[PDB]
Structures are given as structure tokens and as C-alpha cells.
Amino acid sequence: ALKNDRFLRALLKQPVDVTPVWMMRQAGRYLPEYRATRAKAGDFMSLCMNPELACEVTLQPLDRYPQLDAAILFSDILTIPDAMGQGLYPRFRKVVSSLADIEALPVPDPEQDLGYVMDAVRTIRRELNGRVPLIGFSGSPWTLATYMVEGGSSKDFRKSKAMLYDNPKAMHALLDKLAQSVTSYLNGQIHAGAQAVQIFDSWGGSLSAAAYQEFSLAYMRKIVDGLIREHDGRRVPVILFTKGGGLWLESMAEVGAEALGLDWTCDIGSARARVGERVALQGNMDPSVLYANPAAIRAEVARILAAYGKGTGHVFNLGHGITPEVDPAHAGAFFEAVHELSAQYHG
Amino acid sequence: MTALKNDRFLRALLKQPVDVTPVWMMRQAGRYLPEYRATRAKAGDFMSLCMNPELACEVTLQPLDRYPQLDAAILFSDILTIPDAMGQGLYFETGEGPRFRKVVSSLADIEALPVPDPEQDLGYVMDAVRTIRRELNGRVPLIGFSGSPWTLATYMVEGGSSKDFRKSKAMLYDNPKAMHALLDKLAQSVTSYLNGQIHAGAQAVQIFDSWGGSLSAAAYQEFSLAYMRKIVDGLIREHDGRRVPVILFTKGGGLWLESMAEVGAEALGLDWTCDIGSARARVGERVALQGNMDPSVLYANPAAIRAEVARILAAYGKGTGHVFNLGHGITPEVDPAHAGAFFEAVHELSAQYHG
Ligand SMILES: [Cl-]
Ligand SMILES: [Cl-]
Numbered sequence: 001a002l003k004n005d006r007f008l009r010a011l012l013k014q015p016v017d018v019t020p021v022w023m024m025r026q027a028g029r030y031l032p033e034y035r036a037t038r039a040k041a042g043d044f045m046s047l048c049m050n051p052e053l054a055c056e057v058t059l060q061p062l063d064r065y066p067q068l069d070a071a072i073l074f075s076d077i078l079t080i081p082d083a084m085g086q087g088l089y090p091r092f093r094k095v096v097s098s099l100a101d102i103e104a105l106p107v108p109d110p111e112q113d114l115g116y117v118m119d120a121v122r123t124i125r126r127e128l129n130g131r132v133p134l135i136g137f138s139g140s141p142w143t144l145a146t147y148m149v150e151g152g153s154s155k156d157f158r159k160s161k162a163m164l165y166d167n168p169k170a171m172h173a174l175l176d177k178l179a180q181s182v183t184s185y186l187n188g189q190i191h192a193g194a195q196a197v198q199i200f201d202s203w204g205g206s207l208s209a210a211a212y213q214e215f216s217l218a219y220m221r222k223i224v225d226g227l228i229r230e231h232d233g234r235r236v237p238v239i240l241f242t243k244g245g246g247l248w249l250e251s252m253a254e255v256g257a258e259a260l261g262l263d264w265t266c267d268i269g270s271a272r273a274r275v276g277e278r279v280a281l282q283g284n285m286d287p288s289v290l291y292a293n294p295a296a297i298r299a300e301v302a303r304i305l306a307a308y309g310k311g312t313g314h315v316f317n318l319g320h321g322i323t324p325e326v327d328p329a330h331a332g333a334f335f336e337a338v339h340e341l342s343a344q345y346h347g
Numbered sequence: 348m349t350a351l352k353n354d355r356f357l358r359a360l361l362k363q364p365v366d367v368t369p370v371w372m373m374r375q376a377g378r379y380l381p382e383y384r385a386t387r388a389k390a391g392d393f394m395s396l397c398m399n400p401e402l403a404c405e406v407t408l409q410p411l412d413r414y415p416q417l418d419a420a421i422l423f424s425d426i427l428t429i430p431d432a433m434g435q436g437l438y439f440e441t442g443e444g445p446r447f448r449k450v451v452s453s454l455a456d457i458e459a460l461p462v463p464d465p466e467q468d469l470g471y472v473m474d475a476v477r478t479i480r481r482e483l484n485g486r487v488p489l490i491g492f493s494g495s496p497w498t499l500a501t502y503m504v505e506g507g508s509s510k511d512f513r514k515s516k517a518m519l520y521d522n523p524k525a526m527h528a529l530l531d532k533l534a535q536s537v538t539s540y541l542n543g544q545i546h547a548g549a550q551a552v553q554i555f556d557s558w559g560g561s562l563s564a565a566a567y568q569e570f571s572l573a574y575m576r577k578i579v580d581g582l583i584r585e586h587d588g589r590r591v592p593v594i595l596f597t598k599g600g601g602l603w604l605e606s607m608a609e610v611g612a613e614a615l616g617l618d619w620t621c622d623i624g625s626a627r628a629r630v631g632e633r634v635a636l637q638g639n640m641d642p643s644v645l646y647a648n649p650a651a652i653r654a655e656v657a658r659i660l661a662a663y664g665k666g667t668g669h670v671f672n673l674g675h676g677i678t679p680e681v682d683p684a685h686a687g688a689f690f691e692a693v694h695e696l697s698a699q700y701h702g
Contacts, residue, residue, distance in 0.1 A: 156678070158643050165647035165655065208641050209622035210658065246602050247621055266602055267564035286563050288513055292520035300520065303565060323511065 001130040007069040008133050008196065010315050011237040011259050011280045019305065019314050019342035020069035021335050025321030026061040027074050031328060033060050048076050051119035058124050062132060064328065067335035070133050070196070073124065073189065075117055077139040077200060080181050081148050083108035091152035099170040107181050110188025118192045125193030136194030138185050140201035141178035141223070142216035145171065157206055164215060171215065179219040183226040190228045190236055198239040198261070199223065205244020212248055221255045239282055243320060246271070253278040263319030269307035281308070282315040290326045294333040301337040310345045348588030350485045356418040357488050357551065360592035360614050360635045362668045368660065368697035369418035370690050374676030375410040376423050380683060382409050394439065397425045400474035407479050411487065413683065416690035419551070420483060421490040422544065424472055426555065429493070429536050430503050432463035446507035454525040462536045465543025473547045480548030491549025493541050495556035496533035496578070497571035503529065512561055519570055526570065534574040538581040545583045545591055553594040553616070554578065560599025567603055576610045594637055598675065601626070608633040618674030624662035636663070637670040645681045649688035656692035665700045
């Protein structure tokens with residue numbers, strides 16, 4: 001029973017009154033009410049694993065900012081490797097390094113092994129009461145694989161890439177199991193009530209053009225081929241986002257997903273020319289703009305709207321997550337600007 | 348016209364016929380070489396090494412002696428030379444990295460900054476160029492270099508290394524008038540610095556726009572590329588009877604090659620995220636291309652290194668206009684033998700793409 005669905009409409013190239021906006025990490029430490037809930041939870045994993053708390057932080061930006069046109073599931077990108085028994089605490093107690101390691105990895109069952117995520121989705125979907133669509137998400141196979149091979153956050157992905165060039169056979173094995181896992185994970189979230197899904201390929205941008213095709217994109221394509229594309233009588237749009245992936249939009253546009261995420265390095269007008277006929281686009285403002293005065297924030301919104309131009313097919317967002325020191329009022333000025341200034345570009 | 352024994356590097360940059368694809372490597376003088384680390388220890392630190400022309404020459408020549416395949420030398424020097432000469436007080440915080448005592452935050456700060464004179468105020472750099480040019484004895488061309496105005500500006504506004512560049516970009520959006528004033532002054536400075544290096548014997552120059560890739564497409568045009576264009580227009584174009592090729596390198600700038608190619612510089616540097624075949628199709632008629640291998644490949648076994656060299660050569664295809672390099676600097680933990688396999692693969696495997 002969706003009351004506001006312009007976010008979905010834009011992704012599906014349907015007419016809209018204004019350009020929709022949401023923001024990566026809109027539930028995060030820049031919000032004092034998030035910091036309160038996080039302290040109430042006690043630690044970050046408790047917040048993630050408690051569906052009531054995950055819901056609480058998910059709703060917080062929506063209640064603060066009526067301009068936001070979508071909710072995104074609050075969770076950790078690393079749920080799946082954690083579930084595989086790798087012991088997430090940002091590092092892993094168990095680290096992938098041999099083919100033998102990978103073969104032993106189980107493919108997590110969404111409801112039996114990741115039930116708390118599924119519970120969070122159901123809880124959020126209920127509590128939203130149709131106010132805005134709910135976005136489910138997961139990290140990409142390549143991105144999750146690097147976390148599992150690096151053993152956590154990495155200096156420069158030397159180990160992950162070395163293993164890629166030395167033992168591509170083992171890396172294929174790992175990526176394939178992760179593709180399997182991500183597919184069922186997202187399908188789980190969709191069954192639980194997610195109305196769109198986004199794949200975050202956060203580290204795909206560090207790959208060479210060739211390695212990106214073989215070791216990241218091919219596995220996102222596998223996932224999209226396995227996703228539930230319709231639920232609750234509506235299409236469930238898929239958004240692929242490779243940060244730093246602007247060079248590669250053309251191939252990304254042929255995977256069959258509805259939309260591609262963009263970061264600020266890619267001119268969105270150029271992106272629309274290159275692949276606009278095949279996908280919706282989401283993005284792409286540099287988050288650092290939010291540290292500037294409201295006039296500058298408005299000016300940058302106007303520039304980006306002008307670059308995209310007239311008509312549907314754009315969802316406004318940043319090109320990366322907001323950072324903890326941003327003034328919530330500057331975030332608000334951003335969302336307001338998108339709705340106020342974009343109206344002229346529709347109709 | 349002064350003598351070179353090997354000039355295939357220059358010829359590739361100028362789209363002239365070459366026998367093999369030339370190769371050199373960013374940071375080819377650096378901590379991955381044990382002889383470098385020994386010289387650096389004898390100097391005490393990096394800064395002392397940069398400010399002693401005899402030792403800067405010594406490390407500049409080391410990779411050439413170890414690796415006969417290398418087709419160019421690059422001036423060993425500090426990217427932060429100019430803002431130090433400007434008076435901002437470069438030092439090294441024990442646990443972090445280079446920092447400046449003084450940080451740029453206002454138009455008034457910027458107006459006060461002087462434009463260093465290369466020979467009068469950076470004589471130790473010009474001496475290094477002269478010394479290297481002499482000691483090379485024409486074995487390979489010498490590359491001079493500088494940071495770009497945008498890249499230098501970020502160090503001066505942040506006051507050292509930064510992860511997110513929040514302060515630099517905040518100033519870009521909040522105080523464009525001041526940020527442009529800084530960029531303008533730095534372009535003038537970089538121009539005379541590079542020209543001093545050329546007059547001292549540099550035979551090519553590379554502008555390292557290391558942090559230009561963090562800019563939006565729109566901001567890149569106004570706050571970085573426009574100032575590299577200023578520099579290129581002001582550079583000495585010929586010296587010692589030769590054209591002096593200019594290489595512009597914005598790491599992560601692959602989306603922007605078309606505009607970079609309109610500046611008038613001979614060549615553009617690429618990183619591994621850009622398919623070099625695609626790059627050649629997009630701008631190869633206008634510029635030579637340098638790059639573009641992922642430095643991380645050098646951690647892999649030599650067979651993998653050769654296969655990746657082979658792939659990149661196949662992607663560029665037949666004919667001049669390519670200088671092989673990494674897309675980034677080599678890191679200290681790469682085995683010298685792996686770097687060696689790399690250079691040997693480029694010369695051996697590229698022969699078939701020429702003639
Ligand atoms: Cl744009
Ligand atoms: Cl390539």
C-alpha cells in the first residue's frame with residue numbers, strides 16, 4: 001500500500017512530479033538520534049542483529065526529513081561472510097587463503113542463518129506503513145571476497161589482487177559461492193518485503209578494466225539472473241553500484257538491472273548519453289559538498305539537475321555515503337533543493 | 348642537439364617509429380631497492396636525500412644500473428618542493444607523513460605567498476638535474492616533473508596527507524575565489540619550476556595530478572585541468588635541439604581523457620581502470636599514452652606478470668604512441684626480480700607490435 005512511490009517510478013522510467021532523492025548512509029552517525037540508538041544497543045553488531053533497533057535507525061532519517069523518498073535497510077555488508085562462520089568482529093577471525101578454505105564455506109540460508117536480517121526487513125516494511133519504498137541490499141561478490149581474503153579492511157588490496165593473478169581458479173570458486181549466497185540473500189529480503197534491491201560493489205573500482213569484467217561484473221550478472229524480479233504485484237527494481245566504475249557503464253548497462261549508481265567523477269549528462277536509453281541512473285553528488293554553505297549546496301544540486309536534463313530516469317543521491325561530521329541541516333538543505341529545483345525538469 | 352644513446356622513450360611520446368615499446372616505472376628509484384634503502388640510510392632521511400644533489404643523482408641511477416631495459420630516468424625529488432620553497436614549513440611528523448607547519452586558509456594567506464625562482468631558490472633541485480644529466484652520459488632521456496596545481500593546493504590547504512580532502516573541497520565549494528587564487532599562483536610556480544628543470548637538462552616533463560581524480564567531472568575542469576593547461580602553454584617546448592614532450596597524468600582521470608587530450612600536451616598517463624585499447628580509440632589520434640599496469644600485479648609470480656604485460660600490449664595494439672608504465676608507483680615490498688620480469692616482458696613481447 002505505497003503512498004509515495006516516485007523512487008520506484010523514476011527507476012522504472014515512469015513520469016514523476018519531482019526527482020526522487022535518498023542518501024547512502026542516511027541512517028548514520030551524523031544523526032544524534034542514531035548515536036543515541038547505537039549507544040542504546042551497546043555496540044554496532046547488537047544494533048544490526050536486533051530487528052527492532054535496525055528498524056528504529058532505518059526510520060529515523062525518514063521522520064527527520066520528509067523529503068526523503070526511500071528507506072534503506074540498516075545492516076552490515078558483511079552479514080554473509082559472518083554467517084559463513086568467518087567470525088566477524090572490521091576484521092574476521094577466520095581468513096580465506098586456500099582453495100580448501102573456500103570449498104568448506106557453506107552457502108548461508110537466508111531465514112535459518114540470516115533470520116535477523118529477514119526479521120528487520122519484515123519489521124521495517126510493516127512500520128513504514130507504505131510511506132516510502134524499502135530498499136534491500138548486499139555487497140557484491142567481488143567486494144565481499146576481498147573482505148574475506150584480506151581478513152577485513154585493507155591497505156591496498158595487494159593480497160586480494162595477487163591471489164586474483166596467481167590463483168584465478170580459486171578466486172572464481174569463491175566468487176561463485178558468494179554469487180550464490182548474495183542471490184538467495186537478496187531474494188530473502190525481497191520475499192520479506194524489500195521493494196527494490198541495491199548491490200554495493202564498493203571495491204570493484206580498484207580492478208583493471210579487464211579484471212572488473214571477469215571478477216566483479218560477471219558475478220553481479222549471475223546474481224541479477226537469479227533475482228526475484230517481481231513481488232507484491234510490483235516490479236522490484238535492481239540497482240548496481242560500482243563506485244569508481246564510471247568507465248564501465250556500457251557493460252554494466254547490459255546486465256539487465258534497472259539502474260546504475262554513479263559517483264561524482266562521472267558527468268551525469270555524459271552518463272545519460274552513454275547508457276540512459278538502457279538504465280535509470282542514481283547519483284551522483286560529491287558528499288564533500290555537504291560541508292559547504294547551503295547556497296553552494298543548492299548550486300551544486302542545480303548543476304547536476306541541469307546536467308541530467310528533462311524527464312524521468314534519475315534518482316538523486318550522493319556518490320558515496322555521508323560522513324559523521326556533516327550538519328544534519330545541510331543534509332536537509334540538499335534534500336529540499338532536489339525536490340524544489342527538479343520540478344522544472346518534469347512534465 | 349645533444350647526444351642520447353637511447354631515445355626510444357622520446358620517440359614513442361612523439362609518435363615516431365620505435366623498435367620496442369619503451370618502459371619506465373614511477374618510483375623506480377625507491378624503497379623496493381635495497382641499494383636505495385642503503386643510500387637513504389646514509390642520508391638520514393628522505394628530505395636530506397632530496398636536498399643533496401649527489402645522493403639524489405646516486406639513487407636516480409640505481410634502477411638503471413640494475414635494469415638495463417629501463418628507457419628513461421626520472422629526477423629524484425620531493426613533490427612538496429614548491430610549497431616548502433614558498434615558506435610553508437615542510438617537516439615530517441614521526442608517525443604520519445609529510446606535514447606543513449603553515450596551512451593555507453584565507454585569501455590573505457594566499458596573497459602573501461611568493462613564487463619561488465627555480466635557480467635562485469631551488470638550486471638544489473636544479474643542481475640535481477644538471478648532475479644527473481651529466482652522470483647519465485646520454486644512456487637514457489631524463490624526465491623532470493612536478494605536482495599539478497590542484498595536487499599541490501590540496502597539500503597546502505590540508506597541511507599534509509589527507510584521506511577525504513574534506514578541507515580542500517570545502518574550500519573549493521565555499522571559497523572558490525581564494526582557491527582559484529591559490530591554484531593560479533601554483534600554476535605560475537610550477538611553470539617556472541619545470542622550465543628551470545628543462546633549462547637544467549630535463550628532456551621530458553611529467554605533471555603528476557595525483558589527487559585530481561577525487562574531483563567531480565565538473566570541478567576537475569575548473570580547478571585542475573584549467574591550471575595544467577596554463578602550465579602547458581607556458582612551458583619551454585624545445586631545448587638542446589629537441590622537442591621536450593609533456594606528459595599529463597591524472598590518476599583516476601580516465602573518464603576525462605577527451606578534454607585532457609585537447610590541452611596540447613604530447614601524452615597522457617593512464618591507470619589500470621582504463622582499458623588502454625579504449626583509451627587509444629578515444630584520444631590516440633591526439634596523444635601518446637603512458638601506462639597502465641596495476642602495480643599489484645608485481646606481487647604475482649613472473650608468469651602472471653608476463654601474461655598481464657602481454658594483455659596490455661595486445662589491447663594497445665600495433666604501432667608507436669605507447670610508453671609502458673604502471674598506473675601508480677611501485678610499493679616497497681615488491682621483489683626486485685619481479686620488477687625485472689616486468690621490464691623484460693615489455694621489451695621482449697612488444698617487438699611484434701612494431702615494424
Ligand atoms: Cl555531473
Ligand atoms: Cl588495458
